[PDB]
From Swiss-Prot:
One of its GO terms (biological process) is epigenetic regulation of gene expression. Its EC number is 2.3.1.286, 2.3.1.-. The keyword Nucleus applies. This is NAD-dependent protein deacetylase sirtuin-2. It catalyses: N(6)-acetyl-L-lysyl-[protein] + NAD(+) + H2O = 2''-O-acetyl-ADP-D-ribose + nicotinamide + L-lysyl-[protein]; N(6)-tetradecanoyl-L-lysyl-[protein] + NAD(+) + H2O = 2''-O-tetradecanoyl-ADP-D-ribose + nicotinamide + L-lysyl-[protein]; N(6)-hexadecanoyl-L-lysyl-[protein] + NAD(+) + H2O = 2''-O-hexadecanoyl-ADP-D-ribose + nicotinamide + L-lysyl-[protein]. Signal peptide: none annotated. It is an enzyme of class 2 (transferase). Interacts with CDC20, FOXO3 and FZR1. Associates with microtubules in primary cortical mature neurons. Homotrimer. Isoform 1 and isoform 2 interact (via both phosphorylated, unphosphorylated, active or inactive forms) with HDAC6; the interaction is necessary for the complex to interact with alpha-tubulin, suggesting that these proteins belong to a large complex that deacetylates the cytoskeleton. Interacts with FOXO1; the interaction is disrupted upon serum-starvation or oxidative stress, leading to increased level of acetylated FOXO1 and induction of autophagy. One of its GO terms (cellular component) is chromosome, telomeric region.
Amino acid sequence: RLLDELTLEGVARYMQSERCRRVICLVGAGISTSAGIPDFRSPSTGLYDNLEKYHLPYPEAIFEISYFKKHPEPFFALAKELYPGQFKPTICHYFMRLLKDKGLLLRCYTQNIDTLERIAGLEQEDLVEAHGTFYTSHCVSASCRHEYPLSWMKEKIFSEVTPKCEDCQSLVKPDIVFFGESLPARFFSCMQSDFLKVDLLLVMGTSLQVQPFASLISKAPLSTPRLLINKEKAGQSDPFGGGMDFDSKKAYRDVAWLGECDQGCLALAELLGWKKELEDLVRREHASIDAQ
Ligand SMILES: Cc1cc(C)nc(SCC(=O)Nc2ncc(Cc3cccc(OCc4cn(Cc5ccc(OCCN6CCOCC6)cc5)nn4)c3)s2)n1
Ligand SMILES: [Zn+2]
């Protein structure tokens, strides 16, 4: 097996061997909760309680493309309510920036729409946004599709003006994937290529319960180590394949580190000799963002 032991220490030794060249990060809402962004897919989300005042036909309508296109106002009111107070990536985000800097990051697949990976410096081709992103928006008319930056969309959101295209006056929609919309072809193109190449899967802040993330860890080669950094264990197959095997007698490649993603990334960085680099980077970038 590739790991000499099923611990964070074994993963760190593997990462600094010649065998570990290409790391894929799979990240979810748990890497942004310390940035103050709540997980609306969580079983305990307060979202639906807070949706009551929009008198929706049913709560899930907030996520549905057909409802959006006929009644966009609840979505844009909610977007104002939930707009992040700061755009300050976490220790975990900057750990991924170090992976990029050091030439180890093949790809970051993210469930998050908050753009924090981009603020931390991951570039477009580094990222696969499994549920889309607020980073860009597009006019919804097929013959127009004018693109708008987040600054434009933010101004419309905060002024409570439903965003309309300047060229054709159709609705302008953030590039997040509503229910009823398809994943872009790029998700499948990347998945089909990346998981032939991956030497290490870093799974952070995701329960792997929602598609398409629920399909991803089975795509890795059988030998590829998989490290979960999460408040709780996740990814084991339901008792009723390629699911996580942390604890059986046959476990050989999967490691669970249980805690906040920031703490787990700090601990891994420390084992790698990167703790000073990560602390200096985060303190500098956070001070600068607090200044904005
Ligand atoms: C830069 C920036 C700016 C803003 C404004 N915000 C943020 S970030 C802050 C945040 O949230 N802003 C939001 N703005 C709008 C929101 C609503 C919304 C509508 C449509 C798509 C959305 O996104 C993509 C998406 C869609 N799906 C599918 C899905 C899957 C599982 C789900 O479970 C429902 C919850 N149930 C689960 C079990 O039963 C109990 C609870 C729900 C949806 N997944 N992703 C988002 S959310 N950043
Ligand atoms: Zn247009």
